[PDB]
Design an enzyme around this catalytic site. Structure first.
Site, mmCIF file in Angstrom:
data_model
loop_
_atom_site.group_PDB
_atom_site.id
_atom_site.type_symbol
_atom_site.label_atom_id
_atom_site.label_comp_id
_atom_site.label_asym_id
_atom_site.label_seq_id
_atom_site.Cartn_x
_atom_site.Cartn_y
_atom_site.Cartn_z
ATOM 1 N N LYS A 43 0.805 -1.262 0.000
ATOM 2 C CA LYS A 43 0.000 0.000 0.000
ATOM 3 C C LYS A 43 0.836 1.311 0.000
ATOM 4 O O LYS A 43 0.323 2.413 -0.197
ATOM 5 C CB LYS A 43 -0.944 0.017 1.206
ATOM 6 C CG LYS A 43 -2.045 -1.048 1.159
ATOM 7 C CD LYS A 43 -2.611 -1.255 -0.266
ATOM 8 C CE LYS A 43 -3.956 -2.002 -0.264
ATOM 9 N NZ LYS A 43 -3.915 -3.358 0.314
ATOM 10 N N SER A 91 -2.115 -12.981 4.071
ATOM 11 C CA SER A 91 -2.370 -12.882 2.649
ATOM 12 C C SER A 91 -1.170 -13.333 1.799
ATOM 13 O O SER A 91 -1.341 -13.935 0.734
ATOM 14 C CB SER A 91 -2.838 -11.504 2.271
ATOM 15 O OG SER A 91 -1.785 -10.560 2.298
#
Ligand code: PLP
Ligand code: PLP
Lengths: 319, 323
Positions: free
Chosen positions: A45, A268
């Site tokens: 991100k 993840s």
């Protein structure tokens, strides 16, 4: 003209890749992991907080001291945003359900981010809501909208894809990535397919919330993926296949990444790696090269289920 | 297994996690350096694979011992008394190369730190909180003595610790500043960093100043008494063998509160999430860069560790009340 960054923003991206070894025992293809965990703030991100700010500055929608950034998020995006806002002098409002535990919040505040807590019952939808409320009223306010903002998949097409393409010297055959905002798969997938239409692009989602496979949204532990709706930033035309990975199998693979590779990664990354390892056992893939994104460092998740089994044995450890 | 385009001609992909170590970037300091007469470029060890400068010495102490055939995977047992980042750096290396690793530490140790260590498969032995480090060192000496193929790294004594700094950290800064670093500033815990970089840098240019950092509360290099403090990672309370006190031109002593405050501003002004010792080093750097002598010169300073590791220390407890 020294080889030093002017500012934290110039440190983003250009992350490295690492082969998976012992955990890849059995596989007939090679697997190289794209370590977004080594971003200045330890997740993928960091690229989109930079890019949605810059893209906007460039289009002239926002200037520092004037504009107020607003985003419903607590996850890694809030962090990617907070440090960019710190370093650039943009005031930043992040909304999230009150639920959010101290950990992410302490870190977000340490960056100077203002926190607005919404109703826990209401989840994300309550947060987007306050944020549309705050955007809709606040004078200089500006919303990034990480699931709709073309600059999310754009940055991946500009940096992440070319990086993988450069580091593998055009040899990459298959690209595996979990889908959250859809930006990674879409920007990398798009970039790589234009270099080489033969490459396969493979998405990963939770078995408990497989809406691209067909299913409906349900609770799952894979922090970062399976947002529970198809995000606007997902180009579904880009993917060749989606693989559903269970929570249990994500967590188990993440732990083996640590124990066998010395890679400390989030749930993840575990899910993406589980899928890549599966794909790397298919005979049609002998000799091929799979690139897989590990979106975030695992030390960020010490209080989540990833580390629970480990937590239980530590709590009983005698002096 | 499967063949890989390896070696000088093949792909730009690390073979394993060890090859991700080092080559860390530097970043200029901007608004936090408002008022300084010299430029400051920070060496960001916070961006090592596991977020601290110690990833370099987990690697080099282990690699140094393999190279000399003192240890081998699936047989030797690595043993180190360590309350800080050194256990982490040894833990991920031990995991990736297949060593059993036992770490000793006082049972004071936070639970999150233990959790992390154990996720890498390290074995933990807790010692007597009243005995501090000395008690952990004692228990590591006992395990060494009682374990058939045990080997202790001895981060305070092992010359591979400073040597990895002479060979990598020092050269990087010299490549990166294109030989214009006028001054180098570092916190001292084991002395490794200051020793290897200062050695490498004096060799290239004896005119370069080297400045080391300790806590005001444990300022033994300035002639003061050892005590307790909060600048975790520095001020070990004795002068360690890995410190070549000979390459230092000066020792600046910085306090807990200023270290803490400086880390806070690095977060707020620079967007840099650093540990308390990065604050101490930065503070020291800042003062230096305000000495009139130093107008227009380039300072390099080490930031040893990422801040997120310290969400439970004094660094974040004022921010922790706010939530
Ligand atoms: C964002 C994120 C993902 C998904 O990446 P996208 O590019 O948004 O699809 C996966 N894991 C984590 C931890 C993430 O933060
Ligand atoms: C290792 C350490 C230091 C000191 O560096 P040395 O090379 O040991 O002198 C400073 N800060 C932290 C956080 C450390 O772990």
């Amino acid at each position: 003209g020294l080889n030093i960054a002017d500012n934290v923003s110039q440190l983003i991206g250009k992350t490295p890749m690492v082969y998976l070894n012992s955990i890849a025992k059995g596989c007939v293809a090679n697997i190289a992991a794209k370590l977004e965990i080594m971003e200045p703030c330890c997740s993928v991100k960091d690229r989109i907080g930079y890019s949605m700010v810059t893209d906007a500055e460039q289009k002239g929608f926002i200037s520092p001291g004037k504009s107020v950034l607003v985003e419903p998020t607590s996850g890694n995006t809030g962090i990617g945003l907070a440090f960019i806002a710190a370093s650039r002098g943009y005031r930043l409002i992040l909304t999230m359900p009150a639920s959010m535990s101290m950990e992410r919040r302490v870190l977000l505040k340490a960056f100077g981010a203002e926190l607005v807590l919404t109703d826990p019952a209401k989840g994300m939808t309550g947060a987007v809501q306050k944020a549309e409320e705050i955007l809709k009223n606040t004078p200089d306010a500006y919303m990034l909208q990480q699931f709709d903002n073309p600059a999310n998949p754009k940055i991946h097409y500009e940096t992440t894809g070319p990086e993988i393409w450069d580091d593998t010297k055009g040899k990459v055959d298959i690209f595996v990535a979990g889908i959250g905002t859809g930006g990674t798969i879409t920007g990398v997938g798009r970039f790589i397919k234009e270099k080489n239409p033969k490459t396969q692009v493979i998405g990963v989602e939770p078995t408990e919330s497989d809406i691209l496979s067909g299913g409906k949204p349900g609770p799952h532990k894979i922090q970062g993926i399976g947002a529970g709706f198809i995000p606007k930033n997902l180009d579904q035309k880009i993917m060749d296949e989606v693989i559903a990975i269970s929570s249990e199998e994500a967590i188990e693979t993440a732990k083996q990444l640590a124990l066998k590779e010395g890679l400390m990664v989030g749930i993840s990354s575990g899910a993406a790696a589980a899928a890549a390892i599966k794909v790397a056992k298919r005979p049609e893939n002998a000799g091929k090269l799979i690139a897989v994104v590990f979106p975030s460092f695992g030390e960020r998740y010490l209080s989540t289920p990833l580390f629970q089994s480990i937590r239980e044995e530590v709590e009983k450890m005698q002096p």
